[model samples]
Every structure is written in structure tokens, then in C-alpha cells.
Target: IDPFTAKRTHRVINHPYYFPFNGRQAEDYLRSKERGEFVIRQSSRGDDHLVITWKLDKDLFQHIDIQELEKENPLALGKVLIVDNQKYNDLDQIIVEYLQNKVRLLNEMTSSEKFKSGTKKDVVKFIEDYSRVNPNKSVYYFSLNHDNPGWFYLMFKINANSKLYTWNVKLTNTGYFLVNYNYPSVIQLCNGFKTLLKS
Candidate 1:
């Protein structure tokens, strides 16, 4: 039985457990809903828009293609030959800067002894306040359990043009971890669109 969902209380065991299976089995089990895990959806909107919903408590690394996206397009985009290309470049840069600033602020707040002793509500309040300051960015929340040190969910989005650029950041014990997990594949799709534009 998985300890995370087991019913034992007190005298907890700290040792990690392994099932008689591999990564593919683990993924199948998760997708099959055998253990009441959140189901990830590759949902699309209208015709051209796509979204990968990261369900609660899901590790970002477990999701397929996310790592590839990070490796291929770490900066969210590569160089362009023309100056006008900077519009999209500027948008991605702004998002990256905003995320870095927010991560720094969260780190500072969490580092304080006052906040360290504070309740979860206090942490939520800090995030809320940050959101208020930057209303344009979308935010979402999910509670975490003991097995996961970080919060159970994240908040993020791609820019409006759907150009294959995105910013998804996770908030945890120390600070936030931000990544452009959707950009590479998104950029591939957009390049296809560019070809269509040329045609």
C-alpha cells in the first residue's frame, strides 16, 4: 500500500517505498485513477489554442514534454533577424523579469523569522498581496500534503497571442521555481503557423 494514502496514524515511517513497477507502470496507474491521483488534461480551446493542466500535487518533471520544452527553448525563444520580432521578445522578457522579482520577494518574506513562524494563511496572504500588485498575471492555488513539501498546485499562463511562450512557476518552502515548460513545442507549432502565413 502507498503510504501517502494509507490510513495509519502516528509512529510514522520516514523511509521511501517502492512498488514492483517501473515509470511506465507508475504513469499508467496515475492515469488509470487507481490511486485517486489528479488527472492531467491536454485541453485545447477553440481551434489553435492548447493548454496543459497540471493537476494538484503533480511534479512538473513527471509530465512528458515539459523537460524537452525547457531544454530546447530555455529563454522562451531564439534570436530573430528583424527588429520587429522584438515585440514577442519583449513580452517574454517582461514575464521572466516579473517572475524573478516575485520569486525574490517570496524568498525574502519566507526567510524572515516572523513569516517562518506564521501559519499557512500568512503565506497565502503574501501571495494574494503579490497578485494584487500585478493583476494581469493569472493565479491558481492548491493545498499540499506531507509527502510533498511544496504547495500542491501552481499558477501560470502563456501570453495572449498563443505564440508558444509560457511561464509556469511553482511555490514551495524556500521560494518559487519558474520554467517555460510549454514553449518549445509551442514554438514548433507556431513555426508551422508561420509557414502557413507564408503560403
Candidate 2:
């Protein structure tokens, strides 16, 4: 069931499912979600416009522009949320009405795929690098502290004939993998390294 109250929600930014001023990031997030899952975001154009990006199908996404207007209403008098041809009292009303009509509106906040799927690739990459060094004698692995599980090390060499190369992997608070980079996740870092290796 849609867990929302009939009371109007005025502040959009304070909403749990709201993505502030990021349409592309919202689209990226919606792409991984099931159909009907949506996010309310501010337009990237810097204009004061709110857009609801919803995943309608496997590859189809719909963006609905929300307009705020002030009008007189007998029941409630304030800003009217307008979308398409309909005028809703509040954002919550719009969400609930859509849900009640079976329009499939899920605005719940979901965790990112990077945080969920990157652990597997971390193990796989280490194994691939370890095996390559043990048998092929190309690229090597080294650890600084064996006793301390929290702080470990990783090193690699281009070839047995070449010198070793290493760098620090500082975990960033902004959810970016800092392995010598601006990668959003470990999988991106892994695929990026593959490109460098091939080149």
C-alpha cells in the first residue's frame, strides 16, 4: 500500500524520494528500478521546475513536469500542484490519487546498485590478478598488513621484466572508489583498468 497521509506535503526537497537538482542522476537510478518506480527531481536547467521521472517499461521512461499555482479552493486554499491536465492539492495527494487509480506510482527511496553489486567484482578482480601473477608471471600482488584486516595493501607490476606499480585506494565519503580515480563504483574501476590494460 502507498504509505502516505492525506495531509499536503509542501516541501519537496525534504521528501525522502526527492533528488535535488539532478535529472540525469535520477534517470540513472530509475533505469535500474522496476517499472512504476519513480523519483521527483529538480530540473538540471537551473529553472525552478520539478520533474517526476518514472520508469514505465524496460526502456521507456516518462517525465512529468509539476507546476505550482496559487488559487482559491473551498476545502483548502494554497498552492495547487498542476501536472498534465489535472490540478492536485499537494504532491502527496497526487501520489496517492495515482496509486489509488492503479497507475503504479512507487516513490520509495531505493539503495544504489553500486553499493549492492560491487562486492562481487572486488573478489573476482583480486582472484584474476592473483592467478595471473602466480602462473603467467605478469602483474603481482602485495599486502602491507596481514594482522590488520581493516587496512590492507594491493600492488601490481606490468610484467616480470618490468618494475612494480602501486597506489592508494582511499574510500571517499561521496560514494566514489578512489583507486587512482573518479570512478563511481568498483565495477567501473575494474572495467576502466581493463581498458588501460588492453591499450
Candidate 3:
């Protein structure tokens, strides 16, 4: 065995990390990255925007596009996911970069660039807040779920206003609203996302 090889000399470090080292704990590290995994990214077009992209059957040399996930779900965006850290590090980098960029941009963005709720609970809360502000408006929850199994969708319209909004949210093990996106005004309504996941 090469004395300098990675798996050979791997040992516990001296530092104590308050967070997981590779985005997943050692037991579930490789398991979480098996297939159909995805990553999140902040849309370059707007500070409050975020885009989610996933991996397809690319291992068999079969060509796949990220847009396929958007067929029935209009909110899904397409982007190539790249991993440089390790075999399972694609998701590692994705989650780490997601939270890293979350923290990074949160600290860097000004107050004017702020957005609001984007979780299952938070999106519901946003609609609740919207309804509270516009008491007469009626809200609707659609089952046009076309993504992962058992996902959710919501719709809202002001009582006296002509504006409308929709959200496509997916429940995942790691956090709330993994697939958080809306339409008819994604830019203005992109605030339904949380800076951190709780509960």
C-alpha cells in the first residue's frame, strides 16, 4: 500500500467540527449519493433566486437532460451538476456549497435583496401571511405533483387583486422544501425560502 494513499493514512483529525465533514455522516455518506440525487444553486439572475438540478442515468452513457424533471413541474430548472471532491462528493459539494453560499450570500447581500419563506411550512406560512394581509383572498392547494413521490403544490390569489402565485415543494430527509420554486412572479415571490432548516 502506498504510504501516502488517501484510504491508508486516513485518521481522525485534531479539530472538532461543529458540522458534518462531508455533508453526510460516515454511515450514510455514500448511501445518500446513490442515484436520483440533486443539488441547489442560487440563480445568478437574482440574489433571491435558487435553482435545483439533478443527476440522471448518465453512468450508462445514456444522455439525460436536467429539464426532464420539469415536464409536469414548470418550476424545475436545468443545470449540470459537477463534483470535484470525491465519488460521493457531488452531493457533498452540493450541500456544502448550498449552505456555504447560503451563509456567504446572506452575509454579503444587502437588506434590499432580501426574500421570504420557501419551505412546506414556510410556503404555507407565506400564503397565510398573504391571506392575512389580504383577508378576503382565497387560497388553493393543487395536487399537480410531478416530481418526487408525495410532493406538494400551492396556489393563491388576492380577493380584489388579479395577481396569482404558485409553489412546487418537495419533502426530503435533509430539510424543508427541497424543490422550492414558484411562478407568475418567481422573482417577487422567491422569498418563501429559509436561510436555514428547522423542525
Candidate 4:
């Protein structure tokens, strides 16, 4: 494909979240956004694919690959966009599925961001205060599980109108946290998801 056609296929040229941005620009843009927000930007990999850069926490970001694929066989699905392992007829469908949800749960802040050595109650108090002050924003807190010493459970509310959600988190031997041992570290648990899997 020519440059024009290739660029267009990489992203929806006029879409709000789809813009021509490099990796640094994408991260800067999403840094102003609250958790669970995202943007679609051109991939620096130059593979004729786009990337969805999403904010998972205050300092955490997740990048997911997206591409357009056309099968050669007539019996196979043709000219579809692939986001992660799912297939969609168009970018519009993917946006609708991801952005239509009113509330979204995001990942916890890493130790470097803040609250390095606070107790469980301290964490709870800090989050409660933040939630009360910024009722419009997503709030998160964590506490160690009594039955599981190293494991902790995260509690959060997406916003003032949203219900509270909680999930167990564990520090893997590899030095990162995972949710319930199966989902993505970001752990978005909203609409269009199947079986609470990765984002």
C-alpha cells in the first residue's frame, strides 16, 4: 500500500482519539487523562499498525497493538480490525465497546508514585479523603489479605455515581503485580470484556 493508504488504515484520520502522535506525545497526552482513558496513535514500529495507549494508573500506561487484516480465502472473514485477540468489523465497533462504559476500574499506583510505606489503614484513609475531595475522579486503595500474607486486595470506586469494586492483587516473583493471577496488570473490568481477561 502507498503511504496515504497505509496511514489511513493505521488509524481513523478524523476520530477524536485517533491522532498522529509519536510515543512520547501519546504518553504526555494521556498523562493528563484520568485512569481508563486512552488514545490511538501511530506505532513507531513502522509495521503499518496502530497502537492504543491507555492510562492504567497515575504513572502506569498500557500499550495494545491494533491492525487491519484481510484473509485471502473467500470463506474467511475479510478486511477486519484486530484489537488484541478480538476481531471487529471496524474501528467504530472497537471504540463503542471500549468507551461506552460509564465506569471503569484501573490499576493501582506503583510504589514510586506515592504511599511507599503506608499501612493498610493509612492507605484506606488516604483514598477515602481523596475520594471525598475529588468525588468526580476514580479512587483506589489496598490492603493485605489476612489469609494470604503477601497478597493484597484493591478497592476502588470509578466515580461518584459508580459502584465500588474490589479484586485481589499479588506481587509475582518477576517483580510486578497481577490481578487474580490471570488478568492484565491494568485490570479493566468493564463492558465488552469476556471472563475478566486481559485488556
Candidate 5:
């Protein structure tokens, strides 16, 4: 069932659906660009004029609960754009492709010389360099702590501040990402790391 029980729901085209705005909440009762079908939210943030969010195996929904957003935009309630499009829970796989895309681009850049991946020793160095380069809530003392657990987190100081999931496995090329149990944070991380690598 659609989370927002209302008069009408605009739809869009594409699997990982899209809803752009200026406020162009693009589409019809189904996939809009193609006039496909009314699927719920899946794997992507189309564009941002508002805060968008998705849930684990739950229907995608948007709420203008932010006081500032609510006060500033009269259409805030009308701005939520999302779908039943099966949001990908395992971002590990998706992340692999993202890094893979950058890997090809890495060699093309002047700063790519120091960039490295796949090895534990090198990844730790990557963590250190990224932390030192980033602004606030950096990675502090971190560890595999042991062998089996295949995930990592960053922090402002230490574990208590480790809200940032820094990276996960790199068994070859696929294991090198920070998996958030929550997807919106994953989006935030995507934005976060893109910012991290800008320098």
C-alpha cells in the first residue's frame, strides 16, 4: 500500500526511479517518463530540494517535518517524491560498482598516485588520509578488532562517535565499501565520500 494515503500520487519512469524538482516532481500514476507503472520507492535520490528517505523493505516515504523546510516552502507537503521499486538493502554490491567506476577514473587524475585499495594495510592508510583530510567527525581509533567481521566505521573521536561506517570487505574489488543498515545514510555516505575524495 502507498504510505501516503491521499487523493493522488504522481508517478515516474525508470527502475531506480526519478523525481526532479524546481519543483518538478516528475510523472503520472506509474513510471512518468515512460508512463510505466506505479511502483514504490527503490534505489535512488532523484534530486534534492527536500529531504528524501527510504526504508528497509518498507514503502518509500517523504515527510516535511523539518521546521525550516516546512516554514520556507508552501509546497513542502507536496514535494515528497518516491516508490514499490524494491530498494536495494545490500549496498555493498552497488557500492562495488561505484568504486569500480571511480577506479577507472582514478588513473586519469593527477592526484591518483597515492590512491590505493584492496589490501588491509593500504585501506587503513586510506582511512587515515581520508580522516585527516575531511572536516569534522573523522575516523579515530578503529579496527577489524578481529578477523571475521567485515565492516568499518568512522568517528569524531572514537567508538562512541563512530557514526560513520567507513568501509567493509574488499575480497578482491567487491568488498570495499561502508554498508549502512539504513539506505539514506548510505546516500549521505555517498555524498560524504565524494566530498572526501574531492581533495
Candidate 6:
């Protein structure tokens, strides 16, 4: 009993399933080029999951030196370019731009008088409230569906802000879905609501 409108049968993990972005490679490159150490730890439950941990190197910190850069050029300070691509339709590029806009809006509103005095606690509380108001939100999940055995890659962009996050798990034969059960759900719910309101 397929639920969706479209029917998809092709299942291949080698070509399309492969995630072009490599976290370890990115980490190692950052370490060598930027002088930082990034550690990738696999999950103990054998869930084929990994956690990446690292800190920005001091030299790289100078690049986003917010206070100093703001003093010199407010408009350009704290400009974090997480992903860049010459191709217009690059998914990674889209993800980075999406996050940049989100952080930029957050920074703008947080710096306003209404939220100027808000602490990290306040931001967390706001997000919690948003989640509670939208309970049926879907989160991103990923899985390797091939019976034979293959590798897949996941490309994710995290905002520079500090937040511990977890995603949902879902598997299907057609194409993989990565559900960000937390923030993505909230964003989706908000977008849906906005669309409905507009109608």
C-alpha cells in the first residue's frame, strides 16, 4: 500500500545514494589547512551514525572576528561562508544559504530592543514553545537500503550557533529522506502555517 502519489522503484546506493561530502575528509582538511583537530566518533549502538567534534582554530577565528570585524566593517563582519559553489543549483550551496539567512534573521531580531536582553535560555525556550505548538512535524532520517552493501554520504550544514540536535529515522525503497525532527520540523510547520495563512 504505497501512500504517495508518485511510484518509484529504482534502488541503487552507489550512484545517487552516495553523499559527495565526506566529514572526515573535511575535518582532516580543516585540521591541516586551518590548524584544527576534528574527531569523528561512531555510535555505540551500531546504528551507523557518527558524531563530529572539533573547535575552530585560532587563526580561523580571526576570519570571523566579529567584534573587531564589526568595528572595521559592520556589514561584512561575522560573514560566515560555510559552503560555496559556482554551480547555481548545488544542494550544499542551497543549504548553506538557507542557514545563513536563518542566522542572519536571528541575529537581527535578537539584537533588536525587544530581544536585546534575551539570553541563550530565552532562545531555547522560544524554540521549545514552537515545537510544542507543532507536534506532527517530520524530521530528517537517512538509511542504506541496499541489501548487497554500499556507502552513502550525508551533507549537513549547522548554524554557527550552539545547539545539541537529533534527527528522526526513516527508510524507504525509492529515495532516502533525512528528517531533522527538531529544527526542520519547526521550520516546516512554520512554513506550512504561513502558506495556509496566506490563502
Maximum-TM-score candidate: 4
* Runs of candidate 3 exceeding 4 Å displacement: 1-81, 84-99, 105-119, 122-126, 135-165, 168-199
- lDDT for each residue of candidate 1 in 1-199, tens digit (9 for 90 to 100): 3232111221121112223323444455555342123222221111111111222223311321111111123222223211212222322332234323333444443443322232345545555654566566533332232233332223222222222222233443223443322212223323443343365
Q: Which candidate number maximizes lDDT? A: 4
Worst 10 residues of 2 by lDDT: 105-114
| Model 2 C-alpha lDDT per residue in residues 1-199, reported as the tens digit of each score | 3222122322335467776435566768877898667787654442234677766444446566776566343223237777656778777776666422323211110132212112324633664655556655665332322222112233455554454554434322122233456554445654665566685
Q: Can you write out model 3's per-residue Cα lDDT over 47-80, one digit (the tens) per residue?
A: 2223333332122111111112212222322233
Kindly report the root-mean-square deviation of model 5 from the true structure over all alpha carbons: 15.9
Cα RMSD for candidates in order: 19.1, 14.9, 16.5, 13.1, 15.9, 20.0
Write down the lDDT that model 6 would get. Answer: 0.28
Off by over 4 Å in 4: 1-12, 71-78, 99-103, 107-199
| Per-prediction tally of clashes | 0, 0, 7, 0, 15, 9
Q: In candidate 6, which residue pairs clash?
A: 19-153, 139-179, 139-180, 139-181, 140-178, 140-179, 140-180, 141-178, 141-179
Of 1 and 6, which scores higher on TM-score?
Answer: 1
lDDT for 170 in candidate 4 is 51
Q: Which lDDT tens digits does candidate 6 get at residues 97-196? A: 4323433433332243322132334444554454445445422212221221111112111232323243222211112223432223324433443343
| lDDT for residue 59 in candidate 1, whole number 0-100 | 36
Compared with the true structure, all predictions reach lDDT values of 0.30, 0.48, 0.34, 0.54, 0.30, 0.28
- Better candidate by lDDT, 4 or 5: 4
Report how far residue 83 has shifted in candidate 3, in Å: 2.5
User: What ranges in model 5 sit over 4 Å off?
Assistant: 1-116, 130-146, 149-180, 184-199
**Model 6, runs deviating above 4 Å:** 1-88, 118-199
Clashing pairs in 4: none
Tens digits of per-residue lDDT, candidate 4, 35-150, equal 66778776655344567776654555666666757744422323677774777776667666643221122224243232223555666566666777878987665554544433
lDDT of 1 at 60: 19
- TM-score for candidate 2: 0.39
- Candidate 5 per-residue lDDT, tens place, 1-199, comes to 3342122333332334234321113222222222112222221222112222211111211211111112223323222221112222222322334323333322222122333333446556556566655545444322331233223333222222244344442211222344323222333444555465466
Report the Cα lDDT for residue 38, model 3.
Answer: 43
